[PDB]
Design a protein around this ligand. Structure first.
Ligand SMILES: CCCCCCCCCCCCCCCCCC(=O)OC[C@H](COP(=O)([O-])OCC(O)COP(=O)([O-])OC[C@@H](COC(=O)CCCCCCCCCCCCCCCCC)OC(=O)CCCCCCCCCCCCCCCCC)OC(=O)CCCCCCCCCCCCCCCCC
Ligand SMILES: CCCCCCCCCCCCCCCCCC(=O)OC[C@H](COP(=O)(O)OCCN)OC(=O)CCCCCCCCCCCCCCCCC
Ligand SMILES: CCCCCCCCCCCCCCCCCC(=O)OC[C@H](COP(=O)(O)OCCN)OC(=O)CCCCCCCCCCCCCCCCC
Ligand SMILES: CCCCCCCCCCCCCCCCCC(=O)OC[C@H](COP(=O)(O)OCCN)OC(=O)CCCCCCCCCCCCCCCCC
Ligand SMILES: CCCCCCCCCCCCCCCCCC(=O)OC[C@H](COP(=O)(O)OCCN)OC(=O)CCCCCCCCCCCCCCCCC
Ligand SMILES: CCCCCCCCCCCCCCCCCC(=O)OC[C@H](COP(=O)(O)OCCN)OC(=O)CCCCCCCCCCCCCCCCC
Ligand SMILES: CCCCCCCCCCC[C@H](O)CC(=O)SCCNC(=O)CCNC(=O)[C@H](O)C(C)(C)COP(=O)(O)O
Ligand SMILES: [Zn+2]
Lengths: 167, 177, 126, 55, 459, 94, 63, 51, 276, 87, 98
């Protein structure tokens, strides 16, 4: 994962400071898990990845050239508009997994910062509104027949308002 | 459950069936045995007196005021036995009382094991078909003379014959398999 | 006090006057009804206990019940009052009730959205 | 426990003690079972068969 | 999409040409594979709808169904091998062919670009269905049921015929692709307010709405099991598929012209759900269960929110599979019992141990148990309906409580309690009966693992 | 197998019809009390006492055990309600 | 109700295990691919854009 | 084939189905490389972007 | 170390904005309960082997008991509420299967239908809360729902309170837990006694961060918890069935548990659940 | 759990109880000995006897069939028949 | 009464053919009508079908969009652009009325 698309804070751990003669029942167990559960598995896994690296293959990420958007597309020309409703229905999803990440990045930031979520985790929630106030302003009223012509109108009904209110 | 219901009830069976409902609903208020064995021989006294009333009218006026005394002096949660209707185990084991006409669709493999079992079962099924004629005829030859019919069925009355309609009182699912 | 049978919690057998009825007639019906049931009982009990039978005992008393309840209804329908007044309050009554329940809500919602009060926060779905 | 002990003991005194008015409201579960289980299932099924289904 | 179709047509030659003894296996085995070719349409790596050719297309909404339509023909032919095994060897080959034509026609209707191609194929499906119901129907009343099934659909159908020819003149082509990418915005006149009703009413009729659903209880009652499976699983959903593709046009009016139906459906959902509560005929109860769970769908294809639509797509595919499963097991009881009465036949688990497990899972699918697509579906329609008006939960809340009650009552008075004393002894279960069921539920378990495939066009 | 004459018909208008129906339903002619004629469909179906199967003698060998109903006895119109599961009209101590 | 399962639990397990052997051995020895940059004019073929080997053996051969 | 020819009837349908299917592709061949999104110059030794 | 863990094992659907995933939380409530529940379960299965000895279907009975435990633990450790729903409905259905173990007895069947009806009335509340959290703040995952602290959160928590009252036998629809005793005694111990009933108390502790904000619902359950405590206790005084008296005591103690949740003292309420 | 009954263990208990009823002499109680015509007891004492038996064997003899448990033996086969003891 | 047949009973096909599988009366057709139905039904549709359906790649692009977001979120955040700007069709392209 891209430490930058799915961030993750650096870790700060208090150091071991035992103050009891008794023996910790956790440290012993781990010493076992590490030998009877991890080593055995670790061995297999590696052997997996070397089997992979022999005939290493690659897969790319289709890059879609940008076609002309409905805003510029003849009326009635089903050809151009078809290529332009897809370009949008495509960005209706790319603009949706982005919102999936903010749904996620936050969820983690409230598990990683419990009892402080009220505060420490406000870098995100400020963003979850900076992103939700936008998704609400370009994709929400629309029916289940969402189309670029309708986002073009949902916007342009309001561009009057950012022009009637302003005036 | 076995014997058939009489059409109308007599005076007696109504009185003598209160002596049961009453004494048994007195062991729900009086739990301890002693208190009971006391408070109950005092009950019989109540029934013991007014035993020889010959004045029917009166008798049916003591009975009708007994069963109202009782209805208002009954226990909401009496002691009803574990396996009797209304009980706690009533019809519990009925999920295991399959009706025995179902062993007739068993695969020849299943019935292959359990061999002597089906050797005796085929005998009994021969008994059943061997008498249906003598039975139904009995049931009929002994029919009522165009009179009141009860749910009672006749006994055998001849050697070799089997009590009429005996296939489901006998050969009935075991109570607690 | 005195038990008071209601349509539910009915009068028990005991405490019931008619039980305490021994008029000749009653004991003539009470013995004339067992006959019908004994007669029907001895028409079930030697046809179910019949060897050599595979056909389905029918219980025609149940077939007279279903026919009476789903195929003998409309042939016995006569439109009266207490039937059409009550046959319109049931079909259109609530159907008109909820319309003014849903219209008023949907209209309240719409107004508020139009005027700018409804928060619709963190609602990115619908 | 103290109060319950005494009452229980008093029971075994050859002195018959029947229910007080409340004992019934106590033993048959406050009567919520006797009343709300016979009315609701009765007036919810009567309306389907008699009114919504047949009428 | 002519492999899902041409190979299908060829089934007809095989049912006729094949040996009388081997006719059943050739047909059932081959259409199982016909379903396997159908699965290829599911390969949609991209968003673009797969326009196979001018007349034939498959988009997310049709694809989940075409596969179900192909899947049930095998099952239908397996559920009707018993009854219809008493026929003359030419009545069978007619029934098998009739079933074959239904999915040929239904596959095309669900996979049709031109809306009037939908109409011609849409209303043709009545011919095969009416024959299946009337010709082989056991009860004296199927002549009547057939009449009800033909007239309610037909009187609705001619208005749609006039409406679609009308839009062709107004827009100039009934091609669903273009009609979508073209500006057809009705103008809220009094007339348009009629157009909208003309287009939706024919679809609303075969999707039983509370007002016109009397045809479905009567039809499934006397219909043979294969006809009842087809009506519940694919035939009723033809109405839903139509409402999704036709409301692309008539975009503005449904905002305010839907209230009448929405309220008819939600109140209808409660009353249809409730009468299931005391109906003596099991096939009767499943049919009203079908009306109520389809009344939810017309109330999501009208609210028109993304979630509704795929709630609808989820529920339609799911309820289709569940209903058949219920209609199929109802038949197995009917054939041994010989009566549709629910009160008789009590205690079957005691004598048919597994069929009861199938009965239990079918009922849990019927009510909304959560790790099931059936629940996901209702949960979503419920959400949107709540968005339409928070009060909707009350009515969609009385239905959930009632739906739990009748679903379990079918299990409690049919598959539990003491065994019936001695009905004609109930012969053990055939392996066909059990598979016909397994074939219904194993797909219900597999689809619930990955709900994305049946989510609809919206998502 | 069931004749139309052995199946429910219209409200018994004349007294001979009220005694003919009582045969069909295996009842006593003086106990057949047709449901009130208000045209709601009941027809000739007997108006049997509205008592639930709960208080039918729980010991007697009822042919149909669980419905506590014998074979032939007129079934009650609402037996889907007063059955041993759904509703309980049964006398209560209070 | 037992002959059925030995047949259903069998003919699923008949073709089921050779699959499971197939998914496991492919996923083990051959493996999913690792993502890369389109190399200045590779114009990758339809099969090149998918990860799993099995999910590309099909795409290349049939779609 | 001892009257098992019947079997081929259905399979054969698939083959003709796929054949007729290709025919349609051949017909709907305009825009082969004119689709704005996918308009590319033919790579060496390739006369058809999609066949 | 007093540290928690949210584990997202498998993704089920993206469903656009609302992604759905299978998540197990490991907060203090979840692991403390997981240990207490299995200890009780380990006790009961051994009891079950002795109690149902001579039952012809012992294996099926043990099978359903563990399926109950699997649904109960899923209900315990559920991050998104869709999984909480899977557990909430799931224990309801297996309770139906296990209260009426002896299907033949109509009394057991009547109680089983009772239990499903009361649970489904409760389900309407959870669906309402789920739908409100599927709209307004948007995700069924607890980690985000808790960001709805400064919102209204009354429409939703009233829904969960309704769900708890049905599942936890509060004064409204209190009768099915007494009725549930128609089940086998081991079934009565592990599900009627501990795991199934505490589910309603557990749900509100999970959603308490939201509960502390709304004063109105806190006193609402304090009030009904209080009424059930005495109402059930007074009924228990005269009952003459040993299993029934214990069951009423199960309801009262939970009435006390409801009272502490009503007085906004979530941690101690959980402590009583374990000791109870 | 407990051991099943026998047609001679369901007979020794029935005679046992009755031998403890004061009115019924314990030396003239014989299984074929009728309660009301041979031993002397009244009608009310039949109800009381049966009830003892219902409490010795833990089940309820239906009244319609309990109204006839006269012989001190009918009680011994009826109890056994109701409990399926084929000896 | 008119001439018509007496009710035909339904045979206990399980009496002969005790291995009846429910498909046909004669046994061999029975066996060969389940050996081909469990096989074509379960063995190569529920198995091969689920295998193929499971391996459909990035169905409806939802495997592609969780990366394109990641680069867009990678690119938008690092270059300081708003992660989801608030107008999609650029305002400049739109020609509003007057
Ligand atoms: C000491 C011993 C140590 C052993 C260590 C492991 C050794 C080993 O075998 O290496 C792992 C190695 C795989 O690991 P890998 O290659 O490192 O990584 C796997 C790839 O990333 C991916 O490879 P893949 O995806 O091609 O293969 C795995 C895949 C294979 O795909 C299939 O199996 C397709 C179906 C085939 C059916 C055939 C019949 O399995 C799945 O797709 C599982 C999908 C989910 C199944 C379970 C259902 C979950 C949902 C349940 C419904 C309810 C949801 C509720 C949600 C609620 C939320 C609120 O080999 C395998 O084990 C393959 C297993 C395949 C199983 C197929 C059966
Ligand atoms: C507007 C809604 C109806 C408003 C009026 C409702 C009460 C009507 C009272 C009519 C009284 C006379 C009558 O009997 O009904 C008229 C007709 C039958 O008339 P007839 O058979 O001649 O009876 C003569 C009685 N003196 O029978 C009728 O025409 C009844 C007319 C009203 C029927 C309403 C039925 C609505 C059903 C909706 C179902 C939705 C689901
Ligand atoms: C058993 C347990 C079942 C639990 C089911 C719970 C279902 C809850 C449904 C709530 C739906 C509405 C939520 C918001 C209600 C609210 O308080 O605010 C909005 C409401 C809008 O009301 P409106 O008609 O628009 O006019 C009022 C304008 N201020 O403004 C108002 O406050 C007006 C008053 C609203 C009162 C709503 C009461 C609903 C009660 C539902 C359960 C009880 C009824 C069950 C069904 C009875 C009929 C069969
Ligand atoms: C029952 C099922 C549902 C039936 C619905 C029937 C609705 C009425 C018939 C179809 C209505 C319709 O198609 O609406 C639009 C149509 C044309 O209206 P307009 O746009 O004014 O056309 C003139 C263009 N210069 O306007 C019309 O066609 C109006 C026709 C009304 C009368 C048609 C005959 C009805 C017979 C019954
Ligand atoms: C003032 C008091 C406090 C406020 C009101 C609190 C209660 C509100 C309503 C809650 C539901 C009430 C009915 C619950 C179901 C029920 O009670 O079933 C019991 C019935 C008989 O069983 P029972 O009396 O428990 O004892 C058996 C003895 N042999 O067992 C049955 O078989 C009943 C019939 C079952 C099948 C039909 C059930 C009715 C279905 C539709 C109605 C559902 C309940 C009403 C709608 C939801 C209300 C919340
Ligand atoms: C299709 C429209 C409706 C048609 C209805 C009738 C269709 C009948 C004919 C076709 C029946 C089979 C095809 C339909 C069901 C397909 C089920 C399926 O594809 O399962 C998907 C599952 C992987 O799930 P996936 O969504 O990729 O993971 C989510 C990650 N967020 O893949 C799996 O791993 C499933 C595993 C299930 C258990 C198999 C046994 C264990 C071994 C594998 C684990
Ligand atoms: C606790 C609830 C208290 C309720 C007590 C209830 O009132 C009972 C009471 O004490 S008050 C009635 C006493 N008992 C009679 O009223 C019977 C009178 N009936 C006759 O006397 C007959 O004529 C007959 C000769 C048949 C009796 O003879 P017998 O029954 O065969 O033995
Ligand atoms: Zn034991």
């Amino acid at each position: 994962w891209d430490k930058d698309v799915y961030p993750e804070p650096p870790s700060r751990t208090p150091a071991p400071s035992p103050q009891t003669s008794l023996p910790n029942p956790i440290t012993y167990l781990t010493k076992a898990y590490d030998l009877v559960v991890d080593w055995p598995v670790t061995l297999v896994r590696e052997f997996i990845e070397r089997q992979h690296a022999k005939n290493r293959t690659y897969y790319y990420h289709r890059q879609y050239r940008r076609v002309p958007d409905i805003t510029e597309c003849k009326e009635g020309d089903v050809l151009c508009i078809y290529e332009a409703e897809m370009q949008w229905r495509r960005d209706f999803k790319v603009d949706q997994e982005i919102m999936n990440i903010i749904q996620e990045r936050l969820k983690a930031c409230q598990q990683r910062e419990g009892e402080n979520y009220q505060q420490n985790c406000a870098k995100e929630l400020e963003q979850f509104t900076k992103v939700t106030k936008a998704y609400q302003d370009r994709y929400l009223d629309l029916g289940a027949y969402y189309s670029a012509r309708k986002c073009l109108a949902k916007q342009k009904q309001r561009m009057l308002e950012e022009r009637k209110a302003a005036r | 459950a076995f014997c058939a219901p009489p059409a109308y009830l007599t005076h007696q069976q109504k009185v003598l069936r209160l002596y049961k409902r009453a004494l048994r609903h007195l062991e729900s208020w009086c739990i301890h045995r002693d208190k009971y064995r006391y408070f109950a021989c005092l009950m019989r006294a109540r029934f013991e007196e007014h035993k020889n009333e010959k004045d029917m009218m009166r008798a049916t006026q003591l009975l009708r005021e007994a069963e109202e005394e009782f209805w208002q002096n009954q226990h909401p949660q009496p002691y009803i036995f574990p396996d009797s209707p209304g009980g706690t185990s009533f019809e519990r084991y009925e999920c295991y009382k399959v009706p025995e006409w179902c062993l007739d669709y068993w695969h020849p493999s299943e019935k292959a094991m359990y061999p002597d079992y089906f050797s005796k079962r085929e005998q009994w099924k021969k008994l059943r078909m061997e008498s249906w004629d003598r039975e139904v005829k009995q049931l009929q030859e002994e029919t009522s003379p165009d009179g009141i019919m009860t749910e009672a069925l006749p006994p055998a009355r001849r050697e070799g014959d089997l009590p009429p309609l005996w296939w489901h009182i006998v050969t009935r699912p075991r109570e607690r398999p | 006090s005195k038990y008071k049978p209601a349509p539910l919690a009915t009068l028990p057998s005991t405490l019931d006057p008619a039980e305490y009825d021994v008029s000749p007639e009653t004991r003539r019906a009470q013995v004339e009804r067992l006959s019908i049931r004994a007669r029907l009982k001895r028409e079930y009990l030697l046809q179910y206990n019949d060897p050599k039978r595979v056909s389905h005992i029918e219980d025609p008393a149940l077939i007279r019940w279903t026919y009476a309840r789903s195929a003998n209804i409309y042939p016995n329908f006569r439109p009266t009052p207490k039937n059409s007044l009550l046959g319109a309050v049931a079909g259109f009554g609530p159907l008109i009730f909820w319309y003014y329940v849903f219209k008023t809500d949907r209209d309240r919602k719409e107004r508020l959205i139009q005027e700018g009060k409804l928060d619709r926060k963190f609602n990115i779905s619908y | 426990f103290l109060i319950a002990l005494e009452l229980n003991n008093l029971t075994m005194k050859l002195s018959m003690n029947k229910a007080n008015p409340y004992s019934s409201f106590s033993t048959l579960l406050g009567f919520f079972p006797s009343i709300i289980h016979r009315i609701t299932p009765m007036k919810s099924l009567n309306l389907s068969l008699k009114t919504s289904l047949t009428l | 999409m002519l492999k899902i179709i041409l190979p299908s047509l060829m089934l007809l030659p095989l049912t006729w040409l094949s040996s009388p003894k081997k006719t059943w296996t050739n047909v059932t085995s081959y259409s199982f594979l016909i379903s396997l070719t159908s699965l290829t349409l599911l390969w949609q790596t991209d968003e673009n709808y797969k326009n196979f050719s001018n007349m034939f297309s498959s988009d997310p909404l049709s694809t989940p169904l075409i596969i179900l339509t192909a899947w049930l023909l095998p099952l239908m032919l397996m559920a009707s091998q018993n009854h219809l095994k008493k026929d003359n060897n030419v009545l069978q080959k007619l029934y098998i062919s009739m079933l074959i034509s239904l999915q040929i026609l239904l596959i095309m209707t669900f996979s049709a670009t031109e809306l009037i191609m939908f109409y011609i194929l849409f209303e043709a499906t009545l011919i095969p269905t009416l024959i299946i119901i009337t010709r082989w129907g056991n009860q004296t009343e199927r002549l009547n049921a057939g009449i009800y099934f033909l007239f309610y659909t037909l009187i609705g159908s001619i208005p749609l015929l006039i409406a679609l020819i009308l839009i062709q003149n107004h827009v100039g082509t009934l091609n669903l692709m273009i009609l979508s990418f073209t500006t057809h915005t009705l103008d809220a006149s009094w007339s348009n307010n009629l157009l909208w009703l003309a287009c939706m009413m024919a679809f609303l009729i075969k999707m039983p709405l509370y007002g016109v659903h009397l045809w479905l209880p009567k039809a499934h009652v006397e219909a043979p099991i294969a006809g009842s499976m087809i009506l519940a699983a694919i035939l009723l959903k033809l109405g839903s598929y139509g409402m999704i593709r036709i409301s692309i046009i008539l975009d503005p009016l449904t905002k305010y012209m839907a209230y009448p139906f929405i309220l008819l459906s939600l109140w209808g959902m409660i009353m249809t759900s409730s009468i299931c509560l005391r109906q003596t005929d099991l096939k009767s109860l499943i049919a009203y269960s079908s009306v109520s769970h389809m009344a939810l769908v017309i109330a999501s294809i009208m609210i028109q929110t993304p979630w509704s639509f795929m709630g609808a797509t989820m529920l339609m595919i799911a309820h289709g599979l569940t209903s058949s499963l219920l209609f199929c097991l109802a038949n197995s009881n009917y054939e041994r019992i010989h009566s549709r009465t629910m009160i008789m036949a009590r205690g079957l688990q005691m004598v048919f141990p597994l069929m009861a497990t199938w009965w239990l899972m079918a009922s849990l699918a019927n009510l909304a148990l959560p790790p099931s697509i059936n629940l996901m579906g209702e949960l979503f329609i419920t959400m949107s309906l709540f968005s339409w008006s928070n009060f909707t939960i009350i009515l969609m809340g009385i239905n959930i409580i009632i739906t739990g009650m009748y679903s379990m009552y079918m299990i409690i008075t049919t598959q539990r309690g003491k065994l019936t004393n001695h009905m004609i002894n109930l012969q053990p279960s055939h392996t066909r009966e059990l598979t016909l069921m397994a074939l219904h539920m194993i797909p219900l378990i597999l689809l619930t693992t990955s709900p994305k495939l049946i989510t609809g066009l919206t998502m | 197998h069931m004749t139309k004459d052995m199946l429910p018909g219209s409200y018994p208008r004349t007294p001979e019809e009220r005694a003919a129906a009582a045969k069909k339903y295996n009842m006593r002619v003086e106990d057949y009390e047709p449901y009130p004629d208000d045209g709601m469909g009941y027809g000739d179906y007997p108006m049997l006492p509205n008592r639930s199967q709960h208080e039918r003698d729980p010991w007697y060998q009822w042919d149909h055990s669980e419905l506590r109903m014998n074979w032939g006895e007129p079934i009650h119109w609402d037996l889907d309600m007063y059955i041993r599961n759904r509703v309980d009209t049964s006398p209560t101590p209070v | 109700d037992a002959r059925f399962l030995r047949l259903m639990k069998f003919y699923l397990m008949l073709t089921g295990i050779p699959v499971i052997i197939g998914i496991t051995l492919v996923n083990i020895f051959i493996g999913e691919a690792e993502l890369a940059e389109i190399p200045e004019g590779y114009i990758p073929e339809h099969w090149e854009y998918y990860k799993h080997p099995i999910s590309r053996w099909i795409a290349r051969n049939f779609y | 084939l001892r009257e098992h020819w019947v079997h081929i009837l259905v399979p054969a349908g698939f083959v003709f189905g796929c054949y007729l299917d290709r025919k349609d592709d051949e017909k709907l061949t305009a825009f082969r490389n004119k689709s704005m999104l996918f308009q590319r110059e033919l790579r060496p030794n390739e006369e058809v972007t999609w066949k | 170390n007093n540290m928690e863990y949210m584990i997202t094992t498998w993704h089920w659907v993206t469903m656009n904005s609302m992604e759905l995933k299978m998540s197990f939380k490991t907060d203090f409530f979840s692991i403390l309960f997981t240990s207490v529940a299995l200890f009780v379960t380990w006790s009961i299965m051994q009891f079950s082997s002795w109690y149902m000895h001579s039952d012809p279907n012992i294996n099926r009975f043990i099978k359903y008991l563990t399926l109950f435990l699997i649904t109960m633990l899923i209900l315990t450790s559920a991050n998104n509420m869709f999984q909480l729903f899977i557990g909430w409905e799931g224990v309801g259905i297996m309770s139906f299967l296990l209260i009426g173990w002896w299907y033949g007895r109509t009394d057991a069947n009547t109680a089983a239908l009772q239990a499903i009806l009361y649970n489904r009335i409760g389900d309407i509340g959870f669906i309402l809360a789920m739908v409100w959290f599927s709209l307004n703040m948007n995700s069924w995952e607890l980690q985000q729902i808790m960001f709805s602290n400064n919102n209204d959160n009354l429409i939703p928590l009233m829904g969960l309170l309704i769900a708890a009252t049905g599942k936890s036998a509060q004064f409204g629809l209190h009768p099915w837990l007494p009725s549930a005793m128609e089940g086998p005694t081991p079934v009565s111990a592990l599900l009627h006694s501990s795991t199934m009933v505490v589910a309603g108390i557990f749900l509100l502790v999970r959603f308490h961060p939201l509960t502390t904000n709304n004063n109105f619902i806190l006193t609402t359950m304090l009030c009904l918890g209080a009424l059930t405590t005495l109402f059930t206790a007074i009924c228990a005084l005269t009952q003459n069935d040993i299993k029934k008296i214990i069951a009423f005591s199960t309801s009262s103690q939970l009435g006390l548990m409801m009272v502490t949740l009503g007085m906004n003292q979530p941690h101690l309420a959980f402590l009583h659940i374990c000791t109870h | 759990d407990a051991p099943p009954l026998t047609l001679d263990g369901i007979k020794d208990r029935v005679l046992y109880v009755l031998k403890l009823y004061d009115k019924i002499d314990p030396e003239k109680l014989s299984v074929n000995s009728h309660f009301m015509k041979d031993l002397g007891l009244d009608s009310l004492d039949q109800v009381e006897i049966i009830m003892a038996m219902e409490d010795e064997f833990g089940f309820e003899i239906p009244d319609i069939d309990a109204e006839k448990l006269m012989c001190p033996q009918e009680i011994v086969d009826y109890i056994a028949d109701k409990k399926d003891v084929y000896e | 009464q008119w001439q018509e047949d007496p009710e035909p009973e339904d045979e206990n096909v399980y009496a002969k053919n005790p291995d009846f599988h429910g498909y046909d009366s004669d046994p061999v057709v029975d066996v060969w009508n389940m050996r081909a139905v469990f096989f074509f039904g379960f063995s190569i549709v529920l198995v091969f079908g689920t295998t193929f359906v499971a391996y459909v790649p990035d169905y409806r692009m939802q495997e592609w969009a969780r990366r394109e977001a990641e680069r867009l979120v990678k690119y938008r955040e690092v270059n300081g652009l708003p992660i989801m700007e608030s107008n999609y069709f650029d305002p400049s392209k739109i020609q509003l009325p007057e």
